[PDB]
Amino acid sequence: MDYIKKAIWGPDPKEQQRRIRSVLRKNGRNIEKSLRELTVLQNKTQQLIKKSAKKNDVRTVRLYAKELYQINKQYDRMYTSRAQLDSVRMKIDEAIRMNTLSNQMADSAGLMREVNSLVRLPQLRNTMIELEKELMKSGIISEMVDDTMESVGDVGEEMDEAVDEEVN
Amino acid sequence: MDYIKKAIWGPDPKEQQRRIRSVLRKNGRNIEKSLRELTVLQNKTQQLIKKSAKKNDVRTVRLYAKELYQINKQYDRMYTSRAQLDSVRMKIDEAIRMNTLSNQMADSAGLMREVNSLVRLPQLRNTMIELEKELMKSGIISEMVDDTMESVGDVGEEMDEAVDEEVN
Amino acid sequence: MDYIKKAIWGPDPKEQQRRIRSVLRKNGRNIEKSLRELTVLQNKTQQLIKKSAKKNDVRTVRLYAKELYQINKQYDRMYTSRAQLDSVRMKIDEAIRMNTLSNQMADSAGLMREVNSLVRLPQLRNTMIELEKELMKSGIISEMVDDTMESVGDVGEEMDEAVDEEVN
Amino acid sequence: MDYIKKAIWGPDPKEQQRRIRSVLRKNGRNIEKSLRELTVLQNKTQQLIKKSAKKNDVRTVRLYAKELYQINKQYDRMYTSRAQLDSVRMKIDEAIRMNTLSNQMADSAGLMREVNSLVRLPQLRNTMIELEKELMKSGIISEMVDDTMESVGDVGEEMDEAVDEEVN
Amino acid sequence: MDYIKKAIWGPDPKEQQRRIRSVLRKNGRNIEKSLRELTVLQNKTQQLIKKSAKKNDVRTVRLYAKELYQINKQYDRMYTSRAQLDSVRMKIDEAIRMNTLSNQMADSAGLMREVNSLVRLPQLRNTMIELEKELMKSGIISEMVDDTMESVGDVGEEMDEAVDEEVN
């Protein structure tokens, strides 16, 4: 019945989708664990760098200087990988929705407001007399084009200072 | 079966849609005709202004100033109307598509390119071992997560100037 | 089930393909290693040619003149071989894909846009009335040929200056 | 089994495809008929213009100028339509093939010629020792990487004018 | 007949609605039970904390100190969940009504009072002479605009201290 959805997720899409979001969330928590338990190794080193900064021991600071870099080299790729999954998990939750009734109602009512703003504009009045005379008495669209009968075309305050300005 | 689309276009949407687009190009040509047949009234007036520009008759030029104003007031409301319909006819064609197979193929093939760019990032390769081990041998998604298995990573050129910089 | 794929890669194609891309990537890294470790022999010689250029020693420059050529003769074939594998590995990754669902969706949605641009052209309108009346209510193609009902054929602004130009 | 092709052509693609190509040659002949039967109205008019060219009657030639314009306005929209259908019928035949065995043999036998040109380049022979030692004795690919084993390389005529040129 | 109501609640809305309010009320009573039977475990602990507060037993209070926190941690999420369902059950009873005759009469009679307050304002009197002369003798609205004939426009006590204040 829907072939593009099965061309992406396979012969049973609804169990392929919950099979990624198991795996893509187990790895989403192992990053948040390995930044929780690796921040405290950064927090203890801030107590151990500040310890031997007042001790002024060369053999102590240069021994912490090796492990402070190798963990911050580990931190900068695990902090990156948290933003890597969140780019994947957001683009793949967008693929999972993609044709839902929830997005169909949310994107249509946001569009019917944008049509309702445009059908009341006065220069397309004479379209709406012709359009009301032709359409079926349908739902949203035909209920807008007959609700816009609140305008007639009449002359207003014209310019007189431009008539003598054309000869000028 | 199709409730949002019938709520917008009525109980038979496919004939409501071609009933608008029929009307909305009848007015699409009547604007384009009345910008064409009224430009040549502005074109003949540019000759008749240039006629009595050398005659230097105030009783001739200001008689054209009464009718040149009535055409350019008419032109600027009809030139506006061409932008009025084309704002409506573009939004009301977006409402006609809105859930089609034509949008389903277009908005998803451009979405699978964006996932193919993200699954190949080397920080999340450790996810793609676990993800390839779990998924059904599906279409697009499970064909991308094992087409990223044709690569492996290894350690590189570490910084040798970092330890003395950290103790600095 | 697919015989051309097995006529190229043998009785088990999926393990022939990952057996090349092991070998064709080990050699892809031995070139990048042997241009990394041979550039530094070119970089030290730029310190040793510039050394004895100010020393003005004939017996030093003409001894570096032998090894500068034999390494640049080595460099120019190893730099070539990097572009040799990348021509092979790109033509053989194209053979590995060649019938994938990923290329099937990417090359079809790029083609359905090219059909959508052509079916709306006005001279083939009277085809599309006949074509809509005949086709099944299918997916992408039949959803395009009934969406193009937004045009009727009517006369426009004809030429009058060519009628008296035929006698001219 | 075939999801992209059924998404384009519907649940039975093979009868949707011959249902378009049936319609799209019915109009393929009606354009070719109406360019043939309308050329002879242009052909008889070239005699009747040449009739009253020597009669020198303005009341005869300009009566043909009213009907010669109505045929060449009709001819130029029907001559355009022959290029309109042939742009559609070529693209919609490309959509019908798009994944066939006929394209799989044609696009791959032309691809194996291009790999056969690249595996015989002598800079990458050192890959083809390691590649022949690893691959299964397959079809086309492993038959090319050992049909390039009927050759060997050796050092050639070195430059004797390079050392003095480098010290120059 | 009503498509938005079926797009939300499905093909039979009236049995989807009483299928939530079964489930959403069973859970509404299991919270009120599990705060009724968990308050008495808080009430007995207030008799057991106040028991060993005068006994001054360290091994008794610190043993009740473990279970007093684990139940108040249980209480603070079950007290929250009572306010969680009542936010859901009130927003989903608002969805169930949403177009009823009961809300149609209650929101219209509250609106007709607001129109009745505004049509009697004296500056829009001259509208109501024109409006009474045009409308059909309808229900509520036309019965208000002819009931407002109890006013005529006449001059009152004008200011004289502002005439000499303009020159001032």
Swiss-Prot record, chains A, B, C, D, E:
Membrane topology: Peripheral membrane protein
A single GO molecular function term of this UniProt record: identical protein binding
Superkingdom per UniProt: Eukaryota
Principal place of residence: membrane
UniProt subcellular location: Endosome membrane; Endomembrane system
Cellular-component GO terms for this entry: cytoplasm; cytosol; ESCRT III complex; multivesicular body
Biological process, per Gene Ontology: ATP export; endosome transport via multivesicular body sorting pathway; intralumenal vesicle formation; late endosome to vacuole transport; protein transport; ubiquitin-dependent protein catabolic process via the multivesicular body sorting pathway
Keywords assigned: Endosome, Isopeptide bond, Membrane, Protein transport, Transport, Ubl conjugation
Disulfide bond sites: none
Job description of the protein: Class E VPS protein implicated in concentration and sorting of cargo proteins of the multivesicular body (MVB) for incorporation into intralumenal vesicles. The lumenal sequestrated membrane proteins will be targeted into the vacuole after fusion of the endosome with the vacuole. Acts a component of the ESCRT-III complex, which appears to be critical for late steps in MVB sorting, such as membrane invagination and final cargo sorting and recruitment oflate-acting components of the sorting machinery.
Miscellaneous comment: Present with 1890 molecules/cell in log phase SD medium.
Subunit structure, as described in the record: Core component of the ESCRT-III complex (endosomal sorting required for transport complex III). ESCRT-III appears to be sequentially assembled as a flat lattice on the endosome membrane and forms a transient 450 kDa complex that contains DID4, oligomerized SNF7, VPS20 and VPS24. SNF7 oligomerization into a membrane-associated filament is nucleated by association of SNF7 with VPS20; the process is terminated through association of VPS24, possibly by capping the SNF7 filament. VPS24 subsequently associates with DID4/VPS2. Interacts with the VPS4. Interacts with DID2.
Family under the similarity heading: Belongs to the SNF7 family.
Protein name (Swiss-Prot/TrEMBL): Vacuolar protein-sorting-associated protein 24
Protein's organism: Saccharomyces cerevisiae (strain ATCC 204508 / S288c)
Lineage, uppermost ranks: Eukaryota, Fungi, Dikarya, Ascomycota, Saccharomycotina
Name of the encoding gene: VPS24
Residues of the full protein shown: 1 to 168 of 224
